[PDB]
């Protein structure tokens, strides 16, 4: 279920205590707060305090991100807004200074390594002619499409006493005019009339000889990566010197802005400060303790809440019992129910682990899964976060206890189905005659020989479809019920209409996959399709005429407990049997190779397949059941208690 909620709302005859009320009302956290009538309380001095605290918050998480950190909570910073700003300001200034250095080292290196190739090309195209006392050199870049325009411009402007050396490279030409010292101005005018100019080398290096300029780009491009390594080391050291201070200071600032933002949601007047908020009924004892100290001024009571009106407004939080709580991980990310709708969480522990056991159905695989449960239990026991950066996976040790609880339910059903099928690494105990059947009888009779397809397929196909019938009909019964619980007849008719149509479709199929009879099937079929055509004309939901084929396919969709189980079973068997080929053909080396090759192939196909075996069970809940009672049709308001960011440590 979702937890039952009620409205709290303290009032009184004096204004000034309301900040002390908010303080105790965040030390115990139980209340989600709306605006009590509308938001109309603030002061310009309270705005100035809120600006300074939200500046400390933003400046702390900004400088944490410059340091490459994340804004997790810590022990709160001990005292004073003035000390908060005086602690933050020198740290933020150092972090921004090291990032400003890093950005300019990046920009210098980037520009140097671009110009370095054409400068080396032109410095190799030259022979030290730049350093000549008697003549002069003009560097530029061009393309072979237009080099004749430059030769013509020089021919017209100067009396063929120039030179023009060149070399091609990817996408262009390195070009080098040479002239007598008087004529460089004429060469610059000639190039300008060809749409060309001297190549401006990036820095003040434009004043240096070309062969003297190229050396500086080369040494700076070689040296700057070492200076990047130095500023990265200094910025990492600054993080070690200041992370714990920033973490504490960001934690403080979060709580201060939470109180000062929440202060706007009070109603206000001639005496009162009236607050409002939804509270869980199991949480009331803490609200009582938070307000009992303030009975010198407050008056309060808890009002019952209507499920009909405000249903989009009341918050939703879940309250399952301890055997069902871990299975919230499989459902709470999909949607948040509306208040007074159904919570499907307790249906997850009863069907998901049972279908996983039916699919896998191997005692040898169940023991490999049990050894993963023992491994995860070590992180819970030591209180270590699991980290696997390949997946960006981090699990806090409290979440690993949720996974281990679910995995123990999956192991249990996999061993009991593994004795029903007589399966332990496929065929291994059945080669040994520990498990057997009348073809080669053994110590333990196999209850359902899963791979004896001509004997067992009809049993396992009907048994798979029977779960499909049961949950599809239960989800449609929930839709009819939740329609009546709100007098919403458009949901009632859709629920009972699809139910009657599915009874009609099944009674038709049963009467054709066999023999017809009057009383048990041919009557009930016409009642089924009669209730369907009625519910369409009553509701005027014309999407029922298309979607009845969708609903009938969701029953047949459950034959994936047999199909993926039997695909897993035969493949595991033949890998074992390939082991016994090596063991029977050869001597003691064959018993070693047979064990080794079978083990390597089993581990590989247990890696490739198992996430598929976990996924096929859960999605039968997620679409073939949850879409029946309308789980996705509306979103409830998430429960968001007024709390400290410190998470109660």
């Amino acid at each position: 279920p979702m937890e039952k909620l009620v409205l709290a709302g303290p009032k009184g005859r004096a204004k000034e205590l309301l900040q002390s009320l908010q303080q105790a009302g965040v030390v115990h956290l139980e209340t989600l707060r709306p605006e009590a009538l509308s938001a109309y309380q603030l002061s310009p001095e309270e705005r100035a305090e809120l600006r300074r605290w939200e500046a400390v918050s933003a400046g702390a998480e900004h400088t944490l991100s410059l340091l490459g950190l994340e804004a997790e909570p810590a022990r709160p910073f001990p005292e004073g807004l003035e000390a908060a700003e005086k602690a933050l300001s020198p740290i933020q200034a150092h972090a921004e200074g090291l990032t400003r250095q890093k950005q300019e080292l990046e920009e210098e290196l980037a520009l140097a390594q671009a110009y370095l190739e054409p400068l080396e090309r032109l410095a190799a195209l030259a022979h030290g002619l730049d350093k000549s006392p008697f003549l002069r050199v003009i560097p530029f870049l061009l393309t072979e499409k237009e080099l004749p325009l430059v030769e013509e411009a020089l021919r017209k402007a100067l009396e063929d006493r120039y030179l023009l050396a060149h070399e091609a490279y990817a996408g262009g030409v390195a070009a080098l005019v040479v002239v007598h010292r008087k004529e460089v101005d004429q060469a610059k005018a000639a190039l300008s009339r060809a749409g060309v100019a001297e190549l401006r080398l990036p820095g003040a290096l434009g004043e240096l000889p070309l062969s003297e300029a190229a050396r500086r780009l080369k040494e700076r491009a070689e040296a700057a990566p070492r200076e990047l390594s130095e500023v990265r080391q200094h910025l990492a050291k600054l993080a070690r010197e200041s992370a714990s201070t920033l973490q504490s200071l960001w934690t403080r600032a979060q709580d201060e802005v939470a109180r000062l933002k929440a202060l706007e949601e009070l109603a206000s007047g001639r005496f009162g400060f009236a607050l409002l908020g939804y509270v869980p009924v199991k949480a009331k004892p803490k609200v009582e303790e938070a307000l009992a100290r303030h009975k010198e001024s407050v008056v309060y009571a808890f009002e019952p809440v209507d499920e009909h009106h405000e249903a989009d407004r009341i918050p939703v939080v879940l309250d399952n019992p301890p055997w069902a709580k871990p299975f919230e991980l499989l459902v709470s990310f999909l949607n948040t129910p509306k208040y007074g709708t159904f919570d499907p969480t307790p249906v997850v522990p009863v069907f998901f682990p049972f279908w996983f056991g039916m699919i896998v159905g191997d005692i040898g695989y169940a023991l490999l899964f049990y050894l993963v449960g023992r491994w995860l239990s070590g992180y819970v026991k030591r209180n270590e976060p699991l980290v696997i950066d390949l997946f960006a996976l981090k699990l806090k040790p409290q979440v690993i206890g949720k996974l281990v609880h679910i995995l123990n339910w999956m192991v249990f059903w996999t061993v009991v189905w593994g004795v029903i099928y007589g399966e332990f690494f496929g065929t291994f105990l059945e080669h040994l005659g520990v498990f057997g059947t009348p073809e080669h009888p053994g110590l333990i009779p196999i209850l359902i020989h899963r791979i004896d397809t001509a004997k067992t397929a009809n049993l396992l196909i009907l048994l798979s479809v029977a779960f499909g019938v049961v949950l599809v009909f239960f989800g449609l019964a929930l839709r009819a019920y939740l329609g009546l619980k709100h007098r919403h007849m458009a949901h009632f008719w859709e629920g009972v209409g699809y139910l009657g149509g599915l009874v009609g479709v099944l009674a038709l199929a049963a009467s054709y996959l066999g023999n017809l009879q009057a009383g048990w099937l041919q009557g009930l079929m016409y009642l089924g399709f009669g209730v369907f055509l009625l519910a369409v004309l009553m509701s005027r939901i014309w999407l029922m005429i298309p979607e009845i084929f969708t609903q009938a396919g969701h029953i047949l969709s459950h034959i994936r407990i047999y199909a993926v189980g039997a695909a897993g079973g035969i493949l595991a068997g033949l890998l074992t049997d390939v082991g016994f080929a090596l063991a029977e053909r050869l001597g003691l080396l064959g018993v070693l190779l047979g064990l080794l090759v079978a083990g390597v192939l089993h581990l590989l196909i247990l890696l490739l397949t198992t996430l598929g075996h976990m996924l096929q069970p859960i999605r039968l809940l997620w679409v073939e059941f949850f879409t029946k009672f309308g789980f996705y049709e509306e979103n409830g308001r998430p429960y968001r208690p007024f709390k400290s960011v410190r998470e109660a440590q």
């Binding site: 023009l164 070399e167 040479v178």
Partner: peptide, 22 residues
């Protein structure tokens, strides 16, 4: 060009002889 840089490279020897003559 690919040969024209070598023709200018030989022509730079007139600056080498002008420097070597003082």
């Amino acid at each position: 060009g690919l040969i024209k840089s070598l023709a200018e490279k030989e022509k730079q020897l007139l600056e080498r002889l002008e420097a070597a003559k003082k």
